């Protein structure tokens, strides 16, 4: 089997991408944020505290003839930005782009933190990291990909995120028309539960490539590119007037600037992020200070190849017995 679904930016900045997901019988379609940095499929629901729902579409398990309470199971998750959610668990039929999993754990939110309530465009998350990170207790549950894997034509999914435009998540096949050149594959460590890999270096604009190992995670659920402070300083030094602002929370730059590209290495291959992908617009409405799309990871504990990086590539998440990642230009 295979599946193929379009993923759409939630706003004009590509802050996140939403993909329609069919849950239950008859189908209830929710727009979920596919997140290769976490491993829970959770949704706004008829159980979510009413004051914490503001425009999201909800899953109502009582209206699904295939929903079953997973007795005793609860979940609770905290994300890197300090947001969180928690609740109980149903199993139900879940389909993405024509690919159907029966008995998928659908984590129903009883509580969500304010950042989720305040974003009416995201109805929940669909985790695509390794199932060892799933938070369901006392019986950990598998991700949608883990459940689908054995049925797929090939045990892979691909992320093809658009710049200010829709893109595609495919399951079970590699669309050879969706990228240019060849796909370069690189080793993955699953020891922390992430799609963790080592970039071979970087370049700023037309500058020389610096060969240096940068360990980080491929994370479709993170907007920006978070890299070591040395790398980030080298990038922003090429933008006149750019500076790190403690009050704003990162590097800002004059909105009048033209940004240089940023290249990252994948083995001997190179992925080029155009400068425009690094512009996240005014820090507040009407400001002439703009927020940068490359930021320091120093306060995180891990480097994160978020959407800024991934949207410059066609990315293969190869879930074979020994997982690997593939990157191609497009």
From Swiss-Prot:
GO terms assigned for molecular function: aspartic-type endopeptidase activity
The entry's keywords: Aspartyl protease, Disulfide bond, Hydrolase, Protease, Signal, Zymogen
Intrachain S-S bonds: 255-290
Active site per database record: 35, 199
Residues annotated as transmembrane: none
EC number: 3.4.23.22
GO biological process assignments: proteolysis
Annotated Peptidase A1 domain residues: 17-328
Catalytic activity: Hydrolysis of proteins with specificity similar to that of pepsin A, prefers hydrophobic residues at P1 and P1', but does not cleave 14-Ala-|-Leu-15 in the B chain of insulin or Z-Glu-Tyr. Clots milk
Entry's family note: Belongs to the peptidase A1 family.
Protein name: Endothiapepsin
Lineage, top ranks: Eukaryota, Fungi, Dikarya, Ascomycota, Pezizomycotina
Gene designation per UniProt: EAPA
Covered range of the whole protein: 90 to 419 of 419
């Amino acid at each position: 089997s295979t599946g193929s679904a379009t993923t759409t930016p939630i706003d004009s900045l590509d802050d996140a991408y939403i993909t329609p997901v069919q849950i239950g019988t008859p189908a209830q379609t929710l727009n979920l944020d596919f997140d290769t940095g976490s491993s829970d499929l959770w949704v706004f629901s008829s159980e979510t505290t009413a004051s914490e729902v503001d425009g999201q579409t909800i899953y109502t398990p009582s209206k699904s003839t295939t929903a079953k309470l997973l007795s005793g199971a609860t979940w609770s998750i905290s994300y890197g930005d300090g947001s969180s959610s928690s609740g109980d668990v149903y199993t139900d039929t879940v389909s993405v782009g024509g690919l159907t999993v029966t008995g998928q754990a659908v984590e129903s939110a009883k509580k969500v933190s304010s950042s989720f309530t305040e974003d009416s465009t995201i109805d929940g998350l669909l985790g695509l990291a390794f199932s060892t990170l799933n938070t369901v207790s006392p019986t950990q549950q598998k991700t949608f990909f883990d459940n689908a894997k054995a049925s797929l034509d090939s045990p892979v999914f691909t992320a093809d995120l658009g710049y200010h435009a829709p893109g595609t998540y495919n399951f079970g096949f590699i669309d050879t028309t969706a990228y240019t050149g060849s796909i370069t594959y690189t080793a993955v460590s699953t020891k922390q539960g992430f799609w963790e890999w080592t970039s071979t270096g970087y370049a700023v604009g037309s500058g020389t490539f610096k060969s240096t190992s940068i360990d980080g995670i491929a994370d479709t659920g993170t907007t920006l590119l978070y890299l070591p402070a040395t790398v980030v300083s080298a990038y922003w030094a090429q933008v006149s007037g750019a500076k790190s602002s403690s009050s704003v929370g990162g590097y800002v730059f004059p909105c009048s600037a033209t940004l240089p590209s940023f290249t990252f290495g994948v083995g001997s291959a190179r992925i080029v992020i155009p400068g425009d992908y690094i512009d996240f617009g005014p820090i507040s409405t009407g400001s002439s200070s703009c927020f940068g799309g490359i930021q320091s990871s120093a306060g995180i504990g891990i480097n994160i190849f978020g959407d800024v990086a991934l949207k410059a590539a066609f990315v293969v998440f190869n879930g074979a017995t020994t997982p690997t990642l593939g990157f191609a230009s497009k």
